[PDB]
Short mmCIF file of C-alpha atoms and ligand atoms in Angstrom, two decimals:
data_model
loop_
_atom_site.label_atom_id
_atom_site.label_comp_id
_atom_site.label_asym_id
_atom_site.label_seq_id
_atom_site.Cartn_x
_atom_site.Cartn_y
_atom_site.Cartn_z
CA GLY B 51 -37.17 -7.93 3.19
CA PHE B 52 -34.13 -5.68 3.09
CA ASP B 53 -32.47 -4.54 -0.13
CA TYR B 54 -29.51 -6.92 0.21
CA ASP B 55 -28.46 -9.73 2.51
CA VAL B 56 -24.97 -8.29 3.08
CA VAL B 57 -23.39 -4.88 2.49
CA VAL B 58 -19.60 -4.76 2.36
CA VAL B 59 -18.17 -1.26 2.85
CA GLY B 60 -14.76 -0.72 1.27
CA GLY B 61 -13.29 -2.13 -1.92
CA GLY B 62 -9.94 -3.09 -0.42
CA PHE B 63 -8.58 -6.59 -0.04
CA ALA B 64 -10.50 -7.07 3.21
CA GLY B 65 -13.78 -6.01 1.63
CA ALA B 66 -13.09 -7.89 -1.60
CA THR B 67 -12.40 -11.13 0.27
CA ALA B 68 -15.50 -10.66 2.43
CA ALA B 69 -17.65 -10.01 -0.65
CA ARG B 70 -16.26 -13.16 -2.28
CA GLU B 71 -16.95 -15.26 0.82
CA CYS B 72 -20.56 -14.06 1.05
CA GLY B 73 -21.22 -14.24 -2.69
CA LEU B 74 -20.02 -17.83 -2.97
CA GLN B 75 -22.56 -18.54 -0.20
CA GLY B 76 -25.39 -17.31 -2.44
CA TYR B 77 -26.22 -14.25 -0.34
CA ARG B 78 -27.39 -11.08 -2.07
CA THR B 79 -24.17 -9.11 -1.63
CA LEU B 80 -23.58 -5.42 -2.35
CA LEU B 81 -20.19 -3.69 -2.07
CA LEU B 82 -19.79 0.08 -1.72
CA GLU B 83 -16.51 1.86 -2.47
CA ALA B 84 -15.88 5.50 -1.56
CA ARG B 85 -13.20 6.15 -4.18
CA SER B 86 -13.80 5.73 -7.91
CA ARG B 87 -11.29 2.85 -7.96
CA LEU B 88 -10.93 -0.47 -6.16
CA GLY B 89 -7.92 -1.76 -4.24
CA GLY B 90 -7.94 0.76 -1.40
CA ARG B 91 -4.44 1.13 0.05
CA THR B 92 -3.11 -0.74 -3.00
CA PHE B 93 -2.96 1.15 -6.28
CA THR B 94 -1.01 0.32 -9.44
CA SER B 95 -0.40 3.36 -11.64
CA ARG B 96 2.23 4.37 -14.19
CA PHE B 97 4.99 6.97 -14.17
CA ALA B 98 7.84 7.96 -16.50
CA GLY B 99 6.60 5.29 -18.91
CA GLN B 100 6.52 2.25 -16.62
CA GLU B 101 4.18 0.55 -14.18
CA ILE B 102 4.57 1.64 -10.54
CA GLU B 103 2.89 0.83 -7.23
CA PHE B 104 1.69 3.71 -5.05
CA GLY B 105 0.48 1.35 -2.32
CA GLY B 106 1.00 -2.22 -1.21
CA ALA B 107 2.01 -4.73 -3.86
CA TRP B 108 4.65 -7.13 -2.50
CA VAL B 109 3.56 -10.52 -1.14
CA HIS B 110 5.14 -13.82 -0.14
CA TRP B 111 4.16 -17.46 0.32
CA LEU B 112 5.01 -17.21 4.02
CA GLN B 113 1.82 -15.12 4.12
CA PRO B 114 -0.83 -17.85 4.26
CA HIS B 115 -4.14 -16.22 3.32
CA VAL B 116 -3.23 -14.17 0.24
CA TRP B 117 -0.99 -17.00 -0.95
CA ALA B 118 -3.94 -19.37 -0.67
CA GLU B 119 -5.93 -16.83 -2.69
CA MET B 120 -3.21 -16.75 -5.36
CA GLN B 121 -3.30 -20.55 -5.51
CA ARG B 122 -7.09 -20.56 -5.81
CA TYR B 123 -6.95 -18.02 -8.64
CA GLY B 124 -3.74 -19.18 -10.34
CA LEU B 125 -1.76 -15.97 -9.87
CA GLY B 126 1.99 -16.45 -10.14
CA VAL B 127 4.77 -14.34 -8.69
CA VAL B 128 6.81 -11.62 -10.39
CA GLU B 129 10.29 -11.18 -8.93
CA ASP B 130 11.95 -7.78 -8.70
CA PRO B 131 15.77 -8.04 -8.74
CA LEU B 132 17.28 -7.11 -5.36
CA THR B 133 20.85 -8.38 -5.76
CA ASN B 134 24.30 -6.85 -5.26
CA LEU B 135 23.49 -3.15 -4.90
CA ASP B 136 25.93 -0.64 -6.37
CA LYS B 137 25.56 1.87 -3.52
CA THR B 138 23.96 1.59 -0.08
CA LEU B 139 23.65 4.76 1.97
CA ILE B 140 22.59 5.76 5.48
CA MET B 141 21.43 9.30 6.27
CA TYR B 142 21.23 10.39 9.89
CA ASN B 143 18.76 12.67 11.64
CA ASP B 144 21.31 15.52 11.47
CA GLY B 145 21.49 15.22 7.66
CA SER B 146 24.76 13.27 7.61
CA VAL B 147 24.84 10.90 4.63
CA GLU B 148 27.43 8.11 4.67
CA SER B 149 27.80 5.56 1.87
CA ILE B 150 28.41 2.10 3.32
CA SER B 151 29.34 -0.44 0.81
CA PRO B 152 26.63 -3.09 0.69
CA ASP B 153 27.60 -6.32 2.46
CA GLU B 154 28.71 -4.55 5.65
CA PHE B 155 25.48 -2.52 5.53
CA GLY B 156 23.35 -5.64 5.14
CA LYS B 157 25.06 -7.64 7.86
CA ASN B 158 25.08 -4.83 10.41
CA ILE B 159 21.37 -4.27 9.77
CA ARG B 160 20.88 -8.02 10.25
CA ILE B 161 22.68 -7.75 13.60
CA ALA B 162 20.55 -4.78 14.65
CA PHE B 163 17.30 -6.46 13.60
CA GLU B 164 18.03 -9.82 15.22
CA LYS B 165 19.06 -8.18 18.48
CA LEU B 166 15.93 -6.02 18.30
CA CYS B 167 13.80 -9.19 18.13
CA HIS B 168 16.03 -11.31 20.36
CA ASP B 169 13.06 -12.59 22.40
CA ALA B 170 10.68 -12.99 19.45
CA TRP B 171 10.14 -16.76 19.64
CA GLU B 172 9.51 -17.06 23.40
CA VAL B 173 7.27 -13.99 23.50
CA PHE B 174 5.29 -15.03 20.40
CA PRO B 175 5.13 -18.81 20.01
CA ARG B 176 1.77 -18.34 18.23
CA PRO B 177 2.08 -15.19 16.08
CA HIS B 178 -1.60 -15.57 15.15
CA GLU B 179 -2.58 -15.41 18.83
CA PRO B 180 -0.64 -12.18 19.48
CA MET B 181 -1.15 -12.10 23.26
CA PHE B 182 -0.99 -15.83 24.00
CA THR B 183 1.96 -15.40 26.34
CA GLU B 184 1.25 -12.53 28.72
CA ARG B 185 4.90 -11.45 28.62
CA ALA B 186 3.93 -9.99 25.26
CA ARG B 187 1.07 -8.30 27.12
CA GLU B 188 3.60 -6.72 29.49
CA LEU B 189 5.95 -5.79 26.63
CA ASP B 190 3.06 -3.90 25.04
CA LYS B 191 3.76 -1.48 27.89
CA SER B 192 7.01 -0.60 26.10
CA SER B 193 8.07 1.23 22.97
CA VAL B 194 10.44 -0.07 20.32
CA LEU B 195 12.80 2.81 21.09
CA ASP B 196 12.62 1.64 24.70
CA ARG B 197 14.36 -1.59 23.68
CA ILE B 198 16.54 -0.02 20.98
CA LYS B 199 18.09 2.01 23.79
CA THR B 200 18.66 -1.13 25.89
CA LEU B 201 20.19 -3.16 23.05
CA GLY B 202 23.42 -1.13 22.93
CA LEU B 203 23.86 -0.90 19.16
CA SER B 204 26.39 0.66 16.86
CA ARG B 205 25.59 4.18 15.78
CA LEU B 206 25.37 2.90 12.21
CA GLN B 207 23.14 -0.04 13.16
CA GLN B 208 21.07 2.02 15.61
CA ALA B 209 20.33 4.50 12.82
CA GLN B 210 19.62 1.61 10.43
CA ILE B 211 17.08 -0.21 12.59
CA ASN B 212 15.51 2.99 13.93
CA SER B 213 14.85 4.25 10.40
CA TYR B 214 13.52 0.76 9.61
CA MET B 215 11.07 0.85 12.52
CA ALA B 216 10.09 4.47 11.81
CA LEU B 217 9.14 3.29 8.33
CA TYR B 218 7.19 0.43 9.90
CA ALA B 219 5.51 2.86 12.31
CA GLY B 220 4.87 5.74 9.90
CA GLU B 221 5.92 7.67 12.99
CA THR B 222 8.87 8.10 15.36
CA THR B 223 9.99 4.90 17.07
CA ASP B 224 9.20 6.47 20.46
CA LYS B 225 5.49 5.93 19.72
CA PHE B 226 5.91 2.53 18.05
CA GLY B 227 4.59 -0.46 19.95
CA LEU B 228 7.04 -3.30 20.59
CA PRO B 229 4.74 -6.36 20.54
CA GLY B 230 3.47 -5.57 17.04
CA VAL B 231 6.98 -5.63 15.59
CA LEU B 232 7.85 -8.80 17.49
CA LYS B 233 4.65 -10.52 16.32
CA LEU B 234 5.22 -9.51 12.70
CA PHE B 235 8.71 -11.02 12.87
CA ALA B 236 7.24 -14.15 14.50
CA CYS B 237 4.74 -14.68 11.65
CA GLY B 238 7.78 -14.61 9.38
CA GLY B 239 9.27 -17.68 11.06
CA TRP B 240 11.43 -16.06 13.77
CA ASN B 241 14.12 -15.93 11.05
CA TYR B 242 15.75 -12.81 9.63
CA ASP B 243 16.44 -14.17 6.14
CA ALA B 244 12.94 -15.59 5.65
CA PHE B 245 11.23 -12.50 7.06
CA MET B 246 13.30 -10.15 4.89
CA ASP B 247 12.44 -12.28 1.85
CA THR B 248 8.86 -10.99 2.33
CA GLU B 249 9.66 -7.28 1.99
CA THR B 250 9.91 -5.99 -1.59
CA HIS B 251 10.78 -9.16 -3.52
CA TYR B 252 7.68 -10.67 -5.17
CA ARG B 253 4.57 -9.07 -6.68
CA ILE B 254 1.36 -10.58 -8.05
CA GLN B 255 0.99 -11.50 -11.71
CA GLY B 256 -1.68 -9.18 -13.05
CA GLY B 257 -1.25 -7.02 -9.95
CA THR B 258 -3.10 -6.44 -6.71
CA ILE B 259 -5.90 -5.12 -8.90
CA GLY B 260 -5.76 -8.45 -10.72
CA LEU B 261 -6.37 -10.37 -7.51
CA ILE B 262 -9.06 -7.88 -6.43
CA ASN B 263 -10.85 -8.31 -9.75
CA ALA B 264 -10.59 -12.09 -9.54
CA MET B 265 -12.20 -12.11 -6.09
CA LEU B 266 -14.91 -9.65 -7.14
CA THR B 267 -15.81 -11.36 -10.42
CA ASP B 268 -16.00 -14.63 -8.47
CA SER B 269 -18.19 -13.21 -5.69
CA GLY B 270 -20.93 -12.18 -8.12
CA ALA B 271 -21.68 -9.20 -5.88
CA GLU B 272 -22.85 -5.77 -7.02
CA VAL B 273 -20.05 -3.20 -6.77
CA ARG B 274 -20.86 0.51 -6.55
CA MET B 275 -18.00 2.99 -6.84
CA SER B 276 -17.69 6.63 -5.78
CA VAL B 277 -20.34 5.88 -3.16
CA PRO B 278 -19.11 6.90 0.32
CA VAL B 279 -20.90 5.62 3.41
CA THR B 280 -21.54 8.36 5.97
CA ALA B 281 -23.78 6.61 8.50
CA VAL B 282 -24.97 3.17 9.60
CA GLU B 283 -28.12 2.59 11.66
CA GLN B 284 -28.94 -0.84 13.09
CA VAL B 285 -32.73 -1.24 13.13
CA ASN B 286 -35.33 -3.98 12.73
CA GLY B 287 -32.90 -6.87 13.09
CA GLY B 288 -30.96 -5.34 10.20
CA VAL B 289 -28.98 -2.24 9.22
CA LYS B 290 -29.56 0.95 7.25
CA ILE B 291 -26.52 2.39 5.44
CA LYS B 292 -26.62 6.06 4.43
CA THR B 293 -24.60 7.35 1.49
CA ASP B 294 -23.23 10.87 1.19
CA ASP B 295 -26.12 11.71 -1.17
CA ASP B 296 -28.60 10.69 1.57
CA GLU B 297 -29.83 7.42 0.05
CA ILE B 298 -30.68 4.59 2.45
CA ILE B 299 -29.77 0.99 1.63
CA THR B 300 -31.14 -1.73 3.91
CA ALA B 301 -29.24 -4.95 4.58
CA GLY B 302 -29.33 -7.88 6.94
CA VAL B 303 -25.72 -7.18 7.95
CA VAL B 304 -22.91 -4.77 7.08
CA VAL B 305 -19.19 -5.57 7.04
CA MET B 306 -17.11 -2.45 7.70
CA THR B 307 -13.65 -2.71 6.12
CA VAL B 308 -12.75 0.99 5.72
CA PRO B 309 -9.47 1.94 7.46
CA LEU B 310 -9.61 2.67 11.17
CA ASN B 311 -8.38 6.25 10.78
CA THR B 312 -11.48 7.06 8.69
CA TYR B 313 -14.13 5.64 11.05
CA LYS B 314 -14.30 9.14 12.55
CA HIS B 315 -16.36 10.26 9.52
CA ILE B 316 -19.06 7.55 9.78
CA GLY B 317 -21.90 7.90 12.29
CA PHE B 318 -23.23 4.79 13.99
CA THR B 319 -26.71 4.40 15.47
CA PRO B 320 -26.64 3.36 18.27
CA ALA B 321 -23.14 4.26 19.46
CA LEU B 322 -20.46 1.59 19.17
CA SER B 323 -18.86 -0.09 22.18
CA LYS B 324 -16.57 2.07 24.31
CA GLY B 325 -13.43 0.15 23.35
CA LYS B 326 -14.41 0.46 19.70
CA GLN B 327 -14.90 4.21 20.22
CA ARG B 328 -11.47 4.55 21.84
CA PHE B 329 -9.90 2.70 18.91
CA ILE B 330 -11.78 4.84 16.38
CA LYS B 331 -10.61 8.10 17.93
CA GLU B 332 -7.03 6.89 18.40
CA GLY B 333 -6.76 5.30 14.97
CA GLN B 334 -3.22 4.16 14.23
CA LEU B 335 0.17 5.78 13.93
CA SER B 336 1.33 5.39 10.32
CA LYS B 337 1.57 8.69 8.41
CA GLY B 338 3.61 7.54 5.42
CA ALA B 339 3.44 8.25 1.71
CA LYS B 340 4.88 6.91 -1.54
CA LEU B 341 7.08 8.86 -3.94
CA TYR B 342 8.78 8.03 -7.25
CA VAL B 343 11.41 10.42 -8.60
CA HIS B 344 13.15 10.30 -11.97
CA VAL B 345 16.53 11.97 -12.45
CA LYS B 346 18.77 12.36 -15.48
CA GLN B 347 21.82 10.46 -14.24
CA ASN B 348 22.13 6.69 -14.08
CA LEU B 349 22.98 5.69 -10.50
CA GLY B 350 22.49 1.92 -10.85
CA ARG B 351 21.12 -0.34 -8.15
CA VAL B 352 20.87 1.83 -5.04
CA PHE B 353 19.46 1.52 -1.52
CA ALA B 354 19.27 4.10 1.25
CA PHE B 355 18.08 4.34 4.85
CA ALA B 356 17.18 7.61 6.57
CA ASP B 357 16.25 8.02 10.22
CA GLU B 358 13.01 9.45 11.48
CA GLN B 359 13.59 13.22 11.27
CA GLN B 360 14.92 13.00 7.73
CA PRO B 361 12.24 12.72 5.04
CA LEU B 362 13.15 10.04 2.47
CA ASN B 363 13.27 7.27 5.04
CA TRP B 364 13.25 4.30 2.64
CA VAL B 365 14.84 4.61 -0.81
CA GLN B 366 15.63 2.05 -3.51
CA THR B 367 16.16 2.00 -7.26
CA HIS B 368 13.14 1.02 -9.37
CA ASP B 369 14.92 0.94 -12.74
CA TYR B 370 18.16 2.19 -14.26
CA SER B 371 19.55 2.72 -17.75
CA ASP B 372 22.13 5.08 -19.24
CA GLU B 373 19.48 6.61 -21.52
CA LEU B 374 16.37 6.56 -19.33
CA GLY B 375 18.31 7.76 -16.30
CA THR B 376 17.39 6.73 -12.76
CA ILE B 377 14.01 6.08 -11.15
CA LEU B 378 13.87 6.25 -7.33
CA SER B 379 11.14 4.40 -5.45
CA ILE B 380 10.81 5.93 -2.00
CA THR B 381 8.64 5.48 1.08
CA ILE B 382 8.30 8.32 3.59
CA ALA B 383 7.36 7.40 7.15
CA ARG B 384 5.82 10.81 7.90
CA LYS B 385 4.42 13.27 5.38
CA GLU B 386 5.15 16.24 7.67
CA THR B 387 8.88 15.66 6.99
CA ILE B 388 8.62 16.25 3.22
CA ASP B 389 5.83 17.69 1.10
CA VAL B 390 5.95 15.86 -2.23
CA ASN B 391 3.60 18.77 -2.95
CA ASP B 392 6.87 20.48 -3.87
CA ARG B 393 9.10 19.33 -6.72
CA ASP B 394 11.52 21.93 -5.32
CA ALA B 395 11.41 20.19 -1.94
CA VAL B 396 11.73 16.70 -3.42
CA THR B 397 14.70 17.83 -5.54
CA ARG B 398 16.33 19.50 -2.53
CA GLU B 399 15.91 16.49 -0.25
CA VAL B 400 17.04 13.88 -2.76
CA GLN B 401 20.06 16.02 -3.68
CA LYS B 402 20.95 15.95 0.03
CA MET B 403 21.56 12.21 -0.52
CA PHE B 404 22.66 12.02 -4.19
CA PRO B 405 24.43 15.37 -4.60
CA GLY B 406 24.33 16.78 -8.12
CA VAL B 407 21.20 15.09 -9.50
CA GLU B 408 18.84 16.54 -12.12
CA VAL B 409 15.20 15.79 -11.28
CA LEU B 410 13.14 15.05 -14.39
CA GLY B 411 9.87 13.74 -12.97
CA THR B 412 7.92 13.29 -9.75
CA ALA B 413 4.94 11.11 -8.83
CA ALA B 414 3.45 10.87 -5.36
CA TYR B 415 0.67 9.47 -3.23
CA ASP B 416 -0.01 11.17 0.12
CA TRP B 417 -1.98 8.45 1.88
CA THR B 418 -2.11 10.71 4.94
CA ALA B 419 -4.08 13.26 2.91
CA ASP B 420 -6.43 10.79 1.21
CA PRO B 421 -9.73 11.05 3.13
CA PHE B 422 -10.37 7.32 2.67
CA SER B 423 -7.04 6.16 4.13
CA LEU B 424 -5.92 9.02 6.39
CA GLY B 425 -2.66 7.16 6.83
CA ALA B 426 -0.73 4.22 5.43
CA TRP B 427 -0.18 0.67 6.57
CA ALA B 428 -1.33 -0.54 9.96
CA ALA B 429 1.04 0.45 12.76
CA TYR B 430 0.12 -0.18 16.40
CA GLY B 431 0.95 2.39 19.04
CA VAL B 432 1.99 1.55 22.58
CA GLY B 433 -0.69 -0.44 24.38
CA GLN B 434 -2.95 -0.86 21.33
CA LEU B 435 -2.32 -4.48 20.30
CA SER B 436 -3.33 -5.89 23.70
CA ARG B 437 -6.91 -4.61 23.28
CA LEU B 438 -7.19 -5.46 19.56
CA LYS B 439 -10.18 -7.61 20.53
CA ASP B 440 -12.37 -4.54 21.00
CA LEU B 441 -11.79 -3.56 17.36
CA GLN B 442 -12.52 -7.10 16.13
CA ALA B 443 -15.72 -7.74 18.09
CA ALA B 444 -18.88 -7.48 16.02
CA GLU B 445 -21.42 -4.97 17.34
CA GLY B 446 -24.94 -6.25 16.76
CA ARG B 447 -25.39 -6.71 13.01
CA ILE B 448 -22.21 -4.72 12.22
CA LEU B 449 -19.06 -6.71 11.42
CA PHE B 450 -15.56 -5.23 11.35
CA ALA B 451 -12.72 -6.37 9.09
CA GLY B 452 -9.60 -4.70 7.72
CA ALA B 453 -5.83 -5.11 7.92
CA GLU B 454 -5.68 -3.35 11.30
CA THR B 455 -8.18 -5.88 12.73
CA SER B 456 -6.23 -8.99 11.71
CA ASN B 457 -4.20 -11.19 14.05
CA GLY B 458 -1.26 -12.14 11.82
CA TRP B 459 0.35 -10.03 9.09
CA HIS B 460 -1.53 -6.95 10.22
CA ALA B 461 0.74 -4.51 8.35
CA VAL B 462 0.22 -5.88 4.82
CA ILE B 463 -2.32 -7.36 2.40
CA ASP B 464 -2.43 -10.77 4.09
CA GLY B 465 -3.98 -9.20 7.18
CA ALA B 466 -6.75 -7.83 4.98
CA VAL B 467 -7.43 -11.18 3.31
CA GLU B 468 -7.62 -12.80 6.76
CA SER B 469 -9.95 -10.04 7.90
CA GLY B 470 -12.24 -10.86 4.97
CA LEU B 471 -12.25 -14.58 5.68
CA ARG B 472 -13.19 -13.97 9.32
CA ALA B 473 -15.91 -11.52 8.27
CA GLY B 474 -17.40 -14.09 5.90
CA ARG B 475 -17.38 -16.67 8.69
CA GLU B 476 -19.27 -14.27 10.97
CA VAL B 477 -21.75 -13.42 8.21
CA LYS B 478 -22.52 -17.10 7.67
CA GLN B 479 -22.93 -17.38 11.44
CA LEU B 480 -25.48 -14.57 11.73
CA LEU B 481 -27.36 -15.50 8.53
CA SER B 482 -27.95 -19.24 9.06
C1 FAD R 1 2.88 2.71 0.57
C2 FAD R 1 2.34 1.38 1.06
C3 FAD R 1 3.13 0.25 0.88
C4 FAD R 1 2.67 -0.99 1.32
N1 FAD R 1 3.34 -2.14 0.97
C5 FAD R 1 2.74 -3.39 1.09
C6 FAD R 1 3.32 -4.50 0.49
O1 FAD R 1 4.37 -4.33 -0.15
N2 FAD R 1 2.73 -5.75 0.61
C7 FAD R 1 1.54 -5.87 1.34
O2 FAD R 1 1.00 -6.98 1.44
N3 FAD R 1 0.94 -4.77 1.95
C8 FAD R 1 1.56 -3.53 1.82
N4 FAD R 1 1.03 -2.39 2.40
C9 FAD R 1 -0.23 -2.55 3.16
C10 FAD R 1 -1.41 -2.62 2.22
O3 FAD R 1 -1.34 -2.04 0.96
C11 FAD R 1 -2.76 -2.63 2.97
O4 FAD R 1 -2.56 -3.24 4.23
C12 FAD R 1 -3.96 -3.41 2.45
O5 FAD R 1 -4.40 -2.85 1.23
C13 FAD R 1 -5.04 -3.35 3.52
O6 FAD R 1 -6.31 -3.46 2.93
P1 FAD R 1 -7.68 -3.12 3.75
O7 FAD R 1 -8.86 -3.78 3.10
O8 FAD R 1 -7.48 -3.66 5.19
O9 FAD R 1 -7.88 -1.67 3.70
P2 FAD R 1 -7.96 -0.64 2.37
O10 FAD R 1 -7.17 -1.46 1.30
O11 FAD R 1 -7.46 0.74 2.59
O12 FAD R 1 -9.53 -0.63 2.06
C14 FAD R 1 -10.39 0.36 2.58
C15 FAD R 1 -11.37 0.79 1.50
O13 FAD R 1 -12.43 1.46 2.15
C16 FAD R 1 -12.80 2.60 1.41
N5 FAD R 1 -13.52 3.53 2.31
C17 FAD R 1 -13.05 4.32 3.33
N6 FAD R 1 -14.08 5.02 3.89
C18 FAD R 1 -15.22 4.69 3.22
C19 FAD R 1 -16.55 5.11 3.37
N7 FAD R 1 -16.95 6.02 4.32
N8 FAD R 1 -17.47 4.54 2.49
C20 FAD R 1 -17.12 3.63 1.52
N9 FAD R 1 -15.81 3.25 1.40
C21 FAD R 1 -14.88 3.77 2.23
C22 FAD R 1 -11.48 3.07 0.80
O14 FAD R 1 -11.64 3.74 -0.43
C23 FAD R 1 -10.75 1.79 0.54
O15 FAD R 1 -11.00 1.38 -0.79
C24 FAD R 1 1.42 -1.13 1.94
C25 FAD R 1 0.64 -0.01 2.12
C26 FAD R 1 1.08 1.25 1.69
C27 FAD R 1 0.14 2.42 1.93
C1 NCT R 2 4.53 -2.97 3.75
N1 NCT R 2 5.27 -2.49 4.91
C2 NCT R 2 4.47 -2.57 6.13
C3 NCT R 2 5.29 -1.74 7.10
C4 NCT R 2 5.81 -0.60 6.24
C5 NCT R 2 5.52 -1.10 4.70
C6 NCT R 2 6.69 -0.87 3.78
C7 NCT R 2 7.72 -1.80 3.74
C8 NCT R 2 8.80 -1.59 2.90
C9 NCT R 2 8.80 -0.44 2.12
N2 NCT R 2 7.81 0.48 2.13
C10 NCT R 2 6.77 0.24 2.97
#
């Protein structure tokens, strides 16, 4: 008799949902978390006196799985105001910064987006079966820049949507797969307004950590923190999991939910399938990071795009007041473009967009540097989505979940919740 029935690896949303599924089944469930905190690529902290989100935290009811979880646990929405900006700006790869006044900005970006996903519906009638139509399979041969070039856009709108998709790719759009973007838009209802409503509009009452804690308290599982898994060995119709302090924990099955980019630091015995190995060594493309700045001046509601060779690719105002000053929430698609390491560099680069600003405070998360994320959100490279199956397939008594392994909203929390549900299904399968 092994130590536990099931061992979940990773205290993210995927792992939390899997642990809940298997605990409600009455299995002896243990969850191991490398970091000293739960939530994984979601993390609520505080800066300059207020609550902030260094990772994922915005959800929507058009996302079925996490919304069902919120319903089950009674978690309401918290709406961030995103109405009538005071200044919308677009910075180009050459450093040019032009202030467009909102409505024109918004409608030209709508044009660029809709023409980018012109064939979304036909290519993806079933967003949850990404490669149902094989025309999506053939489009996975293409980049998103490949179609951006063939859509004949404005220079303004080309810059807009290319910075958008560089954010979504955590990379340069030349490496960004096309079918992933099209499928994500499909899941959103093939509609620009509805899909955009699921961007940075609604957060979870009590926070992503609130939902994580609800799921974990419910599951009844044992949660160990600051316990990294370094190796897994399938033996004896079960599995042995090795921690970084060389302790062995036996289980009937293990559900791996740690990000793809980190699989390279876990040794599997015997070796995983060849497609799984290829995926593990490729990983995914996103190299983003989160950054909050706080400057003396009040700049009101503000939004700003920046294309892929500028650093502060996504910028919006978190809060504003004549006395407090201004707080800038910012997402960077690639950490090699700006090192939030440097308050000098952050001040320089934000002054390039809001000339004459006094930087009071800085707070940053470099997800690319974190050993247990080695990247940000899921972002498929060219040709990856079409073989997603290899990453999903269970290998013996080893089950694989995680946002990157989901079929629907792969680039956000919902993908992780769906991963966990599927993992629980497979666990029930192999333990009944
Ligand atoms: C800046 C940013 C903004 C985002 N915005 C949103 C958003 O607004 N809305 C949204 O829905 N999603 C958003 N996303 C996506 C989102 O936060 C993630 O997709 C989601 O958390 C995926 O969860 P996961 O379980 O699949 O993986 P993770 O949450 O990363 O879970 C992996 C866990 O495994 C652990 N781990 C790794 N290696 C080991 C090991 N060897 N042993 C033990 N444990 C290990 C890690 O510590 C981590 O806790 C955002 C992400 C980022 C980074
Ligand atoms: C949650 N999204 C998934 C793709 C990129 C990420 C995102 C969206 C908006 C602002 N910052 C990050």
